[PDB]
Design a protein around this ligand. Structure first.
Ligand SMILES: [Mg+2]
Ligand SMILES: [Mg+2]
Ligand SMILES: [Mg+2]
Ligand SMILES: [Mg+2]
Ligand SMILES: [Mg+2]
Ligand SMILES: [Mg+2]
Ligand SMILES: [Mg+2]
Ligand SMILES: [Mg+2]
Ligand SMILES: [Mg+2]
Ligand SMILES: [Mg+2]
Ligand SMILES: [Mg+2]
Ligand SMILES: [Mg+2]
Ligand SMILES: [Mg+2]
Ligand SMILES: [Mg+2]
Ligand SMILES: [Mg+2]
Ligand SMILES: [Mg+2]
Ligand SMILES: [Mg+2]
Ligand SMILES: [Mg+2]
Ligand SMILES: [Mg+2]
Ligand SMILES: [Mg+2]
Ligand SMILES: [Mg+2]
Ligand SMILES: [Mg+2]
Ligand SMILES: [Mg+2]
Ligand SMILES: [Mg+2]
Ligand SMILES: [Mg+2]
Ligand SMILES: [Mg+2]
Ligand SMILES: [Mg+2]
Ligand SMILES: [Mg+2]
Ligand SMILES: [Mg+2]
Ligand SMILES: [Mg+2]
Ligand SMILES: [Mg+2]
Ligand SMILES: [Mg+2]
Ligand SMILES: [Mg+2]
Ligand SMILES: [Mg+2]
Ligand SMILES: [Mg+2]
Ligand SMILES: [Mg+2]
Ligand SMILES: [Mg+2]
Ligand SMILES: [Mg+2]
Ligand SMILES: [Mg+2]
Ligand SMILES: [Mg+2]
Ligand SMILES: [Mg+2]
Ligand SMILES: [Mg+2]
Ligand SMILES: [Mg+2]
Ligand SMILES: [Mg+2]
Ligand SMILES: [Mg+2]
Ligand SMILES: [Mg+2]
Ligand SMILES: [Mg+2]
Ligand SMILES: [Mg+2]
Ligand SMILES: [Mg+2]
Ligand SMILES: [Mg+2]
Ligand SMILES: [Mg+2]
Ligand SMILES: [Mg+2]
Ligand SMILES: [Mg+2]
Ligand SMILES: [Mg+2]
Ligand SMILES: [Mg+2]
Ligand SMILES: [Mg+2]
Ligand SMILES: [Mg+2]
Ligand SMILES: [Mg+2]
Ligand SMILES: [Mg+2]
Ligand SMILES: [Mg+2]
Ligand SMILES: [Mg+2]
Ligand SMILES: [Mg+2]
Ligand SMILES: [Mg+2]
Ligand SMILES: [Mg+2]
Ligand SMILES: [Mg+2]
Ligand SMILES: [Mg+2]
Ligand SMILES: [Mg+2]
Ligand SMILES: [Mg+2]
Ligand SMILES: [Mg+2]
Ligand SMILES: [Mg+2]
Ligand SMILES: [Mg+2]
Ligand SMILES: [Mg+2]
Ligand SMILES: [Mg+2]
Ligand SMILES: [Mg+2]
Ligand SMILES: [Mg+2]
Ligand SMILES: [Mg+2]
Ligand SMILES: [Mg+2]
Ligand SMILES: [Mg+2]
Ligand SMILES: [Mg+2]
Ligand SMILES: [Mg+2]
Ligand SMILES: [Mg+2]
Ligand SMILES: [Mg+2]
Ligand SMILES: [Mg+2]
Ligand SMILES: [Mg+2]
Ligand SMILES: [Mg+2]
Ligand SMILES: [Mg+2]
Ligand SMILES: [Mg+2]
Ligand SMILES: [Mg+2]
Ligand SMILES: [Mg+2]
Ligand SMILES: [Mg+2]
Ligand SMILES: [Mg+2]
Ligand SMILES: [Mg+2]
Ligand SMILES: [Mg+2]
Ligand SMILES: [Mg+2]
Ligand SMILES: [Mg+2]
Ligand SMILES: [Mg+2]
Ligand SMILES: [Mg+2]
Ligand SMILES: [Mg+2]
Ligand SMILES: [Mg+2]
Ligand SMILES: [Mg+2]
Ligand SMILES: [Mg+2]
Ligand SMILES: [Mg+2]
Ligand SMILES: [Mg+2]
Ligand SMILES: [Mg+2]
Ligand SMILES: [Mg+2]
Ligand SMILES: [Mg+2]
Ligand SMILES: [Mg+2]
Ligand SMILES: [Mg+2]
Ligand SMILES: [Mg+2]
Ligand SMILES: [Mg+2]
Ligand SMILES: [Mg+2]
Ligand SMILES: [Mg+2]
Ligand SMILES: [Mg+2]
Ligand SMILES: [Mg+2]
Ligand SMILES: [Mg+2]
Ligand SMILES: [Mg+2]
Ligand SMILES: [Mg+2]
Ligand SMILES: [Mg+2]
Ligand SMILES: [Mg+2]
Ligand SMILES: [Mg+2]
Ligand SMILES: [Mg+2]
Ligand SMILES: [Mg+2]
Ligand SMILES: [Mg+2]
Ligand SMILES: [Mg+2]
Ligand SMILES: [Mg+2]
Ligand SMILES: [Mg+2]
Ligand SMILES: [Mg+2]
Ligand SMILES: [Mg+2]
Ligand SMILES: [Mg+2]
Ligand SMILES: [Mg+2]
Ligand SMILES: [Mg+2]
Ligand SMILES: [Mg+2]
Ligand SMILES: [Mg+2]
Ligand SMILES: [Mg+2]
Ligand SMILES: [Mg+2]
Ligand SMILES: [Mg+2]
Ligand SMILES: [Mg+2]
Ligand SMILES: [Mg+2]
Ligand SMILES: [Mg+2]
Ligand SMILES: [Mg+2]
Ligand SMILES: [Mg+2]
Ligand SMILES: [Mg+2]
Ligand SMILES: [Mg+2]
Ligand SMILES: [Mg+2]
Ligand SMILES: [Mg+2]
Ligand SMILES: [Mg+2]
Ligand SMILES: [Mg+2]
Ligand SMILES: [Mg+2]
Ligand SMILES: [Mg+2]
Ligand SMILES: [Mg+2]
Ligand SMILES: [Mg+2]
Ligand SMILES: [Mg+2]
Ligand SMILES: [Mg+2]
Ligand SMILES: [Mg+2]
Ligand SMILES: [Mg+2]
Ligand SMILES: [Mg+2]
Ligand SMILES: [Mg+2]
Ligand SMILES: [Mg+2]
Ligand SMILES: [Mg+2]
Ligand SMILES: [Mg+2]
Ligand SMILES: [Mg+2]
Ligand SMILES: [Mg+2]
Ligand SMILES: [Mg+2]
Ligand SMILES: [Mg+2]
Ligand SMILES: [Mg+2]
Ligand SMILES: [Mg+2]
Ligand SMILES: [Mg+2]
Ligand SMILES: [Mg+2]
Ligand SMILES: [Mg+2]
Ligand SMILES: [Mg+2]
Ligand SMILES: [Mg+2]
Ligand SMILES: [Mg+2]
Ligand SMILES: [Mg+2]
Ligand SMILES: [Mg+2]
Ligand SMILES: [Mg+2]
Ligand SMILES: [Mg+2]
Ligand SMILES: [Mg+2]
Ligand SMILES: [Mg+2]
Ligand SMILES: [Mg+2]
Ligand SMILES: [Mg+2]
Ligand SMILES: [Mg+2]
Ligand SMILES: [Mg+2]
Ligand SMILES: [Mg+2]
Ligand SMILES: [Mg+2]
Ligand SMILES: [Mg+2]
Ligand SMILES: [Mg+2]
Ligand SMILES: [Mg+2]
Ligand SMILES: [Mg+2]
Ligand SMILES: [Mg+2]
Ligand SMILES: [Mg+2]
Ligand SMILES: [Mg+2]
Ligand SMILES: [Mg+2]
Ligand SMILES: [Mg+2]
Ligand SMILES: [Mg+2]
Ligand SMILES: [Mg+2]
Ligand SMILES: [Mg+2]
Ligand SMILES: [Mg+2]
Ligand SMILES: [Mg+2]
Ligand SMILES: [Mg+2]
Ligand SMILES: [Mg+2]
Ligand SMILES: [Mg+2]
Ligand SMILES: [Mg+2]
Ligand SMILES: [Mg+2]
Ligand SMILES: [Mg+2]
Ligand SMILES: [Mg+2]
Ligand SMILES: [Mg+2]
Ligand SMILES: [Mg+2]
Ligand SMILES: [Mg+2]
Ligand SMILES: [Mg+2]
Ligand SMILES: [Mg+2]
Ligand SMILES: [Mg+2]
Ligand SMILES: [Mg+2]
Ligand SMILES: [Mg+2]
Ligand SMILES: [Mg+2]
Ligand SMILES: [Mg+2]
Ligand SMILES: [Mg+2]
Ligand SMILES: [Mg+2]
Ligand SMILES: [Mg+2]
Ligand SMILES: [Mg+2]
Ligand SMILES: [Mg+2]
Ligand SMILES: [Mg+2]
Ligand SMILES: [Mg+2]
Ligand SMILES: [Mg+2]
Ligand SMILES: [Mg+2]
Ligand SMILES: [Mg+2]
Ligand SMILES: [Mg+2]
Ligand SMILES: [Mg+2]
Ligand SMILES: [Mg+2]
Ligand SMILES: [Mg+2]
Ligand SMILES: [Mg+2]
Ligand SMILES: [Mg+2]
Ligand SMILES: [Mg+2]
Ligand SMILES: [Mg+2]
Ligand SMILES: [Mg+2]
Ligand SMILES: [Mg+2]
Ligand SMILES: [Mg+2]
Ligand SMILES: [Mg+2]
Ligand SMILES: [Mg+2]
Ligand SMILES: [Mg+2]
Ligand SMILES: [Mg+2]
Ligand SMILES: [Mg+2]
Ligand SMILES: [Mg+2]
Ligand SMILES: [Mg+2]
Ligand SMILES: [Mg+2]
Ligand SMILES: [Mg+2]
Ligand SMILES: [Mg+2]
Ligand SMILES: [Mg+2]
Ligand SMILES: [Mg+2]
Ligand SMILES: [Mg+2]
Ligand SMILES: [Mg+2]
Ligand SMILES: [Mg+2]
Ligand SMILES: [Mg+2]
Ligand SMILES: [Mg+2]
Ligand SMILES: [Mg+2]
Ligand SMILES: [Mg+2]
Ligand SMILES: [Mg+2]
Ligand SMILES: [Mg+2]
Ligand SMILES: [Mg+2]
Ligand SMILES: [Mg+2]
Ligand SMILES: [Mg+2]
Ligand SMILES: [Mg+2]
Ligand SMILES: [Mg+2]
Ligand SMILES: [Mg+2]
Ligand SMILES: [Mg+2]
Ligand SMILES: [Mg+2]
Ligand SMILES: [Mg+2]
Ligand SMILES: [Mg+2]
Ligand SMILES: [Mg+2]
Ligand SMILES: [Mg+2]
Ligand SMILES: [Mg+2]
Ligand SMILES: [Mg+2]
Ligand SMILES: [Mg+2]
Ligand SMILES: [Mg+2]
Ligand SMILES: [Mg+2]
Ligand SMILES: [Mg+2]
Ligand SMILES: [Mg+2]
Ligand SMILES: [Mg+2]
Ligand SMILES: [Mg+2]
Ligand SMILES: [Mg+2]
Ligand SMILES: [Mg+2]
Ligand SMILES: [Mg+2]
Ligand SMILES: [Mg+2]
Ligand SMILES: [Mg+2]
Ligand SMILES: [Mg+2]
Ligand SMILES: [Mg+2]
Lengths: 145, 88
RNA sequence: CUGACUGCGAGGCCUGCAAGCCGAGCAGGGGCGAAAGCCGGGCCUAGUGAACCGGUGGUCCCGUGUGGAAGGGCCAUCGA
RNA sequence: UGGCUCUUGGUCGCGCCUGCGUAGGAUAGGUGGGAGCCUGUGAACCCCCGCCUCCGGGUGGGGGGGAGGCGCCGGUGAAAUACCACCCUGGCGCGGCUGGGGGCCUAACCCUCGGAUGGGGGGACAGCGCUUGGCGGGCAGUUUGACUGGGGCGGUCGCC
RNA sequence: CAGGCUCUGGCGACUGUUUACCAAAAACACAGCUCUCUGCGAACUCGUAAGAGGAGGUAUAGGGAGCGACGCUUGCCCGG
RNA sequence: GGCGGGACCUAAGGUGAAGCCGAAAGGCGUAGCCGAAGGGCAGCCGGUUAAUAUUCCGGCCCUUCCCGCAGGUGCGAUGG
RNA sequence: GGAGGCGUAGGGAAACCGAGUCCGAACAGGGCGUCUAGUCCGCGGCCGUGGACCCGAAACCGGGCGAGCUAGCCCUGGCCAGGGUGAAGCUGGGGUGAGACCCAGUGGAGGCCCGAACCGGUGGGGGAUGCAAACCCCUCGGAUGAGCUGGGGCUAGGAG
RNA sequence: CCCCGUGGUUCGUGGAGCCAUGGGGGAAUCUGGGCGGACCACCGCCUAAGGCUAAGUACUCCGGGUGACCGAUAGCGCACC
RNA sequence: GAGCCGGUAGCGGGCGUGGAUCCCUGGAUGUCCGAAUGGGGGAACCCGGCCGGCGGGAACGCCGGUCACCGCGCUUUUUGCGCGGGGGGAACCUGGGGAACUGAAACAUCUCAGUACCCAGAGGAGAGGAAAGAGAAAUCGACUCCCUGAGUAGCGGCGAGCGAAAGGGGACCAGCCUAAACCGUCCGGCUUGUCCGGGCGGGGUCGUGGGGCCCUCGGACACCGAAUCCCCAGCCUAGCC
RNA sequence: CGCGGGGUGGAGCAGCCUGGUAGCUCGUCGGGCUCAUAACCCGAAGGUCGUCGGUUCAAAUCCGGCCCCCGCAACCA
């Protein structure tokens, strides 16, 4: 039998695969439990879709990655917000890091996809690491003051 | 019987016993006899309800292929036998 | 020494049919013999089996659109 | 018609090892090559381990050790004893193809339970389908001669 | 209206059963003995099948076989 | 209306929703339905006609159903 | 209406050749064939195929019809005068340590006895174009049983 | 499509193809696939596994026409209630 | 166009040129049984639901209507409503099953014979039908039926028997629609997708291979044409001269 | 016919692997021992190992053919 399984099994293999099994294992177990599925013509193609869809999808996102990657590199976010003589009056988060960016330019960016644990409370200039894609890191220059 | 997607009756075709060489001759004895189609039951789900098929061994797959086409189908309505029927 | 031949076969006996039997001489090619000539098994009359089906050897022949092959035919012989 | 696992066979490729009468110093399956071959592509003498046995040697894996080690002819047997090669007899380690045997499982299939989508027993067995060979007056179709001082029994059946 | 009796053999224990229409018996049957199959979806029977009987029974039960109350007994042979 | 049968019940059997089986015809089958000389159910004596009579008549006696009333009570079913 | 048929050339298994051709090395022999017939219609005699002059089986096979006779079972009802014998049990008495057991009474057992109905059909006579396609008279067997009998229903042809 | 078991055809297993198909294995989409009597090559023919379609054909319950058909033991079993 | 109230006279009593009887067409009515169909059942009988009516009429009875099962489709399951099936027909037809006598001078392969007969289905016919054909002609061109081919080619216990096709002569004459690629839309499902599937519409039908999509031709009014539809002629179902 | 495996002492078989090997039981004779057959113990004779050809240093052994008995199924117009 040809079958496309929807569940990893030490037996046959990881999900989305396509492996030959004796019809029985299919008909009277794998197929009805739903651990696997008759790999008809329709399904094989329904699997193309399932690939192509996310396949081109991710690449098209990574697109909008080299889009920001270029803008975010040739730029520094000057962040004017009151401060002592070293420490800050209050604090700057990614949320702020984000809005200042979306204002100071109009470039929108997810606050979360931005590496920064505790909010900045020091005065100075940094480079935080942004990440919309796990293969497209972006060093963002900044400057609280 | 024959019944399902199968489409196969049971043909009555004789079986003739012979004694022979082939390098000397070959002679006979002959009688009518009925050949049956290897035939099994197939149980399957299809929405609610079970549903069996008195199918031949040949087309066992056709039946599963049928349940696949049934997913694209709108059914229910307490249709035990009725599914099978409306199941093409 | 190998006529226990090959290719024939005028003409008859016998006989319902089928079969059985005797056979001069012709060609080929050969044996014995000085030669005349004799040799187509055994002094003779029993020691046998139609046809069909098939086997082995061969061979001008046939070979399903054509070339082969399969198979068959023909000659020889085999299994009552 | 299925899941897991142990176990074993055939067969092919690869790898590797076995097959010990005197003799030659020898316990050398075959045939042929070539005098040269090993060792730092770390050797001889020695400790540990697996396997074989003709009970001697043999071969594979771990160490000490250190540049030393084997062969040749003569000798000698039927053949030459380094080393390399194709291959044999028998066996071991890997994979390819392929089958036989045991065990367990459950979901097919089968039985069952005051409906159960379920639970319990059986279980890849059994049932059934195609195909194999067998047993097979339970049943079926037929056959079971002619002569013949009636038939049978007996005798005979063609050729000289 | 209404038994002739007795003695003594054979067969079969016994009441029963039977060849409607030439045979009522010494024939069958019988309680009883032995062998054998069958562990239950039993074996066996009818049916292509589903199914049914077996039995809504479970080896002290069910199928098949032979012998045939009861008493005494039932030897040897496993080559085919 | 009262006897017998039917507008009641169920037996063997038959039939047969569901379900199962079978080349066709068909075969099996739960419920249910059918199925009686079984269960259930109210009439006796006498008269009369050429010819009927628990059938007409006479006497005496009884059943079910519908409506209304009076009295009484949780009434109510193919289910227990 | 010329499709078509027969006839005009045979010999050979054929390849093939042709008044020849086959066998054969053969311009030996020999088989068969050359030196022409034919066809179409009517009629008659016979032959082949069909039932083939006519009438006749015992049988076989396919589909149906029958258990209102008879056989078995299933359901539900009915029937068996009268007489006889007198089992167990129980009661009582006897008996013994208790008991087995004994006797009497009571009791009403039985494919028990006699014998009608009813169910048979033993022997004889009769009947034999019968009263009758199985009867009649005398006689005889069973008669609470494995009894007989009404109504309902089931099983059948290689089947019951 | 090949194999096993068969049926059809003139074809009785035969050198047995073709059409069909009960069991088993099991493709391809025109550079595909079937066939021309085992097989192979060459050369041809043809496009399977969906379906429909008049007429020319068969029959005589029925009505009509006609006979070198019968004439009541013939002619249909029946001339007729 | 003169009679008439059948065969069928008689008792009794009517009708017809105000055109009867009679014949042709259409309509009406049509008890109960039968596919039989509300339910039952031993055909021609018995019992009942719902709605409306009849009688004094609630009990009873009668009348009119209506109520089997099965398939297909709308009905959302529902319960409905709508079209269809059921049964019969002499022979003929197709399909599923399918003998034996007999022949072979016995008999088993073989024959009789895919006949007899059983079953289902079709219909004025039925089947078959446009080539995955035939078969040797670098030919033919659906199917059916007749002649011939031919008692040939073959098949065969090479027995008994059985027995083609192509080709030629005639009858008739007709070709078509889908599946798939691709496009559009409606619905479902789901791992929301540039999807899967189901239905409906466009598209497409071939062997000189055809079709789809893309680009160029101009893409066209024209050209062909029903086997469906309408009307008419003709014809049949009474007559008349 | 093709398939298979053997012809070893007076009887067979082991030896035929994977060549370096004739031994077994009974039997014959002799000796020991017993009342005694016999049991038993010691010792000896009786095999081109069916046949011929070939490999090899060497065979019953591996190989060809042949001669024969046994067995296998399968065919007989
Ligand atoms: Mg499998
Ligand atoms: Mg500031
Ligand atoms: Mg300040
Ligand atoms: Mg902005
Ligand atoms: Mg963005
Ligand atoms: Mg973003
Ligand atoms: Mg990634
Ligand atoms: Mg079935
Ligand atoms: Mg099939
Ligand atoms: Mg069928
Ligand atoms: Mg067979
Ligand atoms: Mg052969
Ligand atoms: Mg034959
Ligand atoms: Mg026959
Ligand atoms: Mg037969
Ligand atoms: Mg299954
Ligand atoms: Mg079902
Ligand atoms: Mg298969
Ligand atoms: Mg689908
Ligand atoms: Mg429903
Ligand atoms: Mg429902
Ligand atoms: Mg349906
Ligand atoms: Mg629908
Ligand atoms: Mg002569
Ligand atoms: Mg003669
Ligand atoms: Mg002679
Ligand atoms: Mg003579
Ligand atoms: Mg002499
Ligand atoms: Mg003489
Ligand atoms: Mg013969
Ligand atoms: Mg011959
Ligand atoms: Mg030759
Ligand atoms: Mg010659
Ligand atoms: Mg040639
Ligand atoms: Mg040749
Ligand atoms: Mg041909
Ligand atoms: Mg040619
Ligand atoms: Mg050829
Ligand atoms: Mg030849
Ligand atoms: Mg030959
Ligand atoms: Mg298996
Ligand atoms: Mg060796
Ligand atoms: Mg040695
Ligand atoms: Mg020396
Ligand atoms: Mg070398
Ligand atoms: Mg050298
Ligand atoms: Mg040198
Ligand atoms: Mg070296
Ligand atoms: Mg080296
Ligand atoms: Mg060691
Ligand atoms: Mg060694
Ligand atoms: Mg040297
Ligand atoms: Mg060497
Ligand atoms: Mg592996
Ligand atoms: Mg392996
Ligand atoms: Mg492997
Ligand atoms: Mg295992
Ligand atoms: Mg287990
Ligand atoms: Mg368990
Ligand atoms: Mg379990
Ligand atoms: Mg479980
Ligand atoms: Mg199964
Ligand atoms: Mg269940
Ligand atoms: Mg279950
Ligand atoms: Mg379960
Ligand atoms: Mg289970
Ligand atoms: Mg278990
Ligand atoms: Mg087991
Ligand atoms: Mg099994
Ligand atoms: Mg036996
Ligand atoms: Mg027997
Ligand atoms: Mg037999
Ligand atoms: Mg026999
Ligand atoms: Mg017999
Ligand atoms: Mg016969
Ligand atoms: Mg005979
Ligand atoms: Mg005689
Ligand atoms: Mg005599
Ligand atoms: Mg006499
Ligand atoms: Mg005799
Ligand atoms: Mg003679
Ligand atoms: Mg008296
Ligand atoms: Mg008396
Ligand atoms: Mg007296
Ligand atoms: Mg006596
Ligand atoms: Mg007696
Ligand atoms: Mg006795
Ligand atoms: Mg009695
Ligand atoms: Mg009796
Ligand atoms: Mg009697
Ligand atoms: Mg009697
Ligand atoms: Mg009689
Ligand atoms: Mg009689
Ligand atoms: Mg008597
Ligand atoms: Mg008797
Ligand atoms: Mg008994
Ligand atoms: Mg006894
Ligand atoms: Mg037992
Ligand atoms: Mg039987
Ligand atoms: Mg049976
Ligand atoms: Mg049972
Ligand atoms: Mg029971
Ligand atoms: Mg018993
Ligand atoms: Mg005694
Ligand atoms: Mg005895
Ligand atoms: Mg004795
Ligand atoms: Mg014996
Ligand atoms: Mg024995
Ligand atoms: Mg024995
Ligand atoms: Mg009364
Ligand atoms: Mg009454
Ligand atoms: Mg009633
Ligand atoms: Mg009643
Ligand atoms: Mg009732
Ligand atoms: Mg009942
Ligand atoms: Mg039925
Ligand atoms: Mg049916
Ligand atoms: Mg029934
Ligand atoms: Mg009835
Ligand atoms: Mg009733
Ligand atoms: Mg009653
Ligand atoms: Mg009563
Ligand atoms: Mg009273
Ligand atoms: Mg009164
Ligand atoms: Mg009273
Ligand atoms: Mg009276
Ligand atoms: Mg009165
Ligand atoms: Mg109460
Ligand atoms: Mg309450
Ligand atoms: Mg109450
Ligand atoms: Mg000729
Ligand atoms: Mg001449
Ligand atoms: Mg002459
Ligand atoms: Mg001549
Ligand atoms: Mg001449
Ligand atoms: Mg002439
Ligand atoms: Mg003439
Ligand atoms: Mg003539
Ligand atoms: Mg003649
Ligand atoms: Mg003839
Ligand atoms: Mg005759
Ligand atoms: Mg004649
Ligand atoms: Mg004749
Ligand atoms: Mg009766
Ligand atoms: Mg009687
Ligand atoms: Mg009495
Ligand atoms: Mg007394
Ligand atoms: Mg006392
Ligand atoms: Mg007492
Ligand atoms: Mg006393
Ligand atoms: Mg006592
Ligand atoms: Mg006492
Ligand atoms: Mg007493
Ligand atoms: Mg007493
Ligand atoms: Mg008394
Ligand atoms: Mg008595
Ligand atoms: Mg008596
Ligand atoms: Mg009386
Ligand atoms: Mg009587
Ligand atoms: Mg009497
Ligand atoms: Mg009498
Ligand atoms: Mg008598
Ligand atoms: Mg008498
Ligand atoms: Mg008399
Ligand atoms: Mg008389
Ligand atoms: Mg008289
Ligand atoms: Mg009497
Ligand atoms: Mg008596
Ligand atoms: Mg009775
Ligand atoms: Mg009775
Ligand atoms: Mg009655
Ligand atoms: Mg009969
Ligand atoms: Mg019959
Ligand atoms: Mg019988
Ligand atoms: Mg019988
Ligand atoms: Mg083919
Ligand atoms: Mg097979
Ligand atoms: Mg086979
Ligand atoms: Mg085949
Ligand atoms: Mg057939
Ligand atoms: Mg055939
Ligand atoms: Mg034929
Ligand atoms: Mg044939
Ligand atoms: Mg054939
Ligand atoms: Mg085929
Ligand atoms: Mg098939
Ligand atoms: Mg084909
Ligand atoms: Mg062809
Ligand atoms: Mg060909
Ligand atoms: Mg073609
Ligand atoms: Mg085509
Ligand atoms: Mg196609
Ligand atoms: Mg087509
Ligand atoms: Mg077509
Ligand atoms: Mg077609
Ligand atoms: Mg048609
Ligand atoms: Mg005609
Ligand atoms: Mg007429
Ligand atoms: Mg006429
Ligand atoms: Mg006329
Ligand atoms: Mg006339
Ligand atoms: Mg007359
Ligand atoms: Mg007449
Ligand atoms: Mg007259
Ligand atoms: Mg007359
Ligand atoms: Mg008539
Ligand atoms: Mg008439
Ligand atoms: Mg009459
Ligand atoms: Mg009449
Ligand atoms: Mg008039
Ligand atoms: Mg009148
Ligand atoms: Mg009148
Ligand atoms: Mg009148
Ligand atoms: Mg009158
Ligand atoms: Mg009158
Ligand atoms: Mg008058
Ligand atoms: Mg008139
Ligand atoms: Mg008139
Ligand atoms: Mg009318
Ligand atoms: Mg009316
Ligand atoms: Mg009616
Ligand atoms: Mg109705
Ligand atoms: Mg009815
Ligand atoms: Mg009303
Ligand atoms: Mg009213
Ligand atoms: Mg009406
Ligand atoms: Mg009504
Ligand atoms: Mg129904
Ligand atoms: Mg329906
Ligand atoms: Mg509709
Ligand atoms: Mg519907
Ligand atoms: Mg609608
Ligand atoms: Mg709809
Ligand atoms: Mg509906
Ligand atoms: Mg609605
Ligand atoms: Mg609904
Ligand atoms: Mg309705
Ligand atoms: Mg309804
Ligand atoms: Mg409609
Ligand atoms: Mg119709
Ligand atoms: Mg019809
Ligand atoms: Mg047919
Ligand atoms: Mg058929
Ligand atoms: Mg016969
Ligand atoms: Mg005979
Ligand atoms: Mg035939
Ligand atoms: Mg037929
Ligand atoms: Mg039908
Ligand atoms: Mg019909
Ligand atoms: Mg037609
Ligand atoms: Mg058609
Ligand atoms: Mg086409
Ligand atoms: Mg025939
Ligand atoms: Mg004929
Ligand atoms: Mg013809
Ligand atoms: Mg033609
Ligand atoms: Mg033509
Ligand atoms: Mg004409
Ligand atoms: Mg045409
Ligand atoms: Mg769509
Ligand atoms: Mg659809
Ligand atoms: Mg479409
Ligand atoms: Mg379309
Ligand atoms: Mg179109
Ligand atoms: Mg187009
Ligand atoms: Mg086409
Ligand atoms: Mg193209
Ligand atoms: Mg376009
Ligand atoms: Mg334009
Ligand atoms: Mg255009
Ligand atoms: Mg059209
Ligand atoms: Mg006219
Ligand atoms: Mg008219
Ligand atoms: Mg006039
Ligand atoms: Mg063997
Ligand atoms: Mg021996
Ligand atoms: Mg031995
Ligand atoms: Mg030995
Ligand atoms: Mg000794
Ligand atoms: Mg000797
Ligand atoms: Mg020897
Ligand atoms: Mg010797
Ligand atoms: Mg012998
Ligand atoms: Mg022997
Ligand atoms: Mg053997």
């Amino acid at each position: 039998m040809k079958v496309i399984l929807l569940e990893p099994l030490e037996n046959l293999g990881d999900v989305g695969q396509v492996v030959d099994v004796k019809p029985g294992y299919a008909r009277n177990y794998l197929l009805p439990r739903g651990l696997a599925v008759l790999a008809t013509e329709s399904n094989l193609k329904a699997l193309e879709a399932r690939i192509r869809a996310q396949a081109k999808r991710l690449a098209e996102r990574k697109a909008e990655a080299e889009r920001l990657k270029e803008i975010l590199e040739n730029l520094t976010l000057t962040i004017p917000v009151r401060a002592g003589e070293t420490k800050i009056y209050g604090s700057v988060t990614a949320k702020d890091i984000a809005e200042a960016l979306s204002r100071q330019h109009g470039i929108t960016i997810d606050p979360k996809r931005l590496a920064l644990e505790k909010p900045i409370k020091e005065l100075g200039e940094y480079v935080l690491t942004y990440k919309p894609h796990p293969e497209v890191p972006i060093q963002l220059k900044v400057s609280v003051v | 019987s024959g019944k399902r997607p199968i489409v196969a009756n049971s043909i009555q075709r004789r079986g003739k016993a012979k004694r022979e060489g082939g390098v000397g001759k070959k002679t006979t004895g002959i009688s009518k006899r009925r050949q049956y189609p290897n035939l099994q039951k197939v149980r399957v789900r299809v929405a609610g309800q079970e549903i069996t098929f008195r199918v031949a061994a040949s087309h066992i797959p056709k039946v599963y292929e049928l349940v696949e086409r049934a997913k694209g189908l709108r059914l229910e309505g307490l249709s035990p036998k009725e599914i099978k029927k409306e199941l093409l």
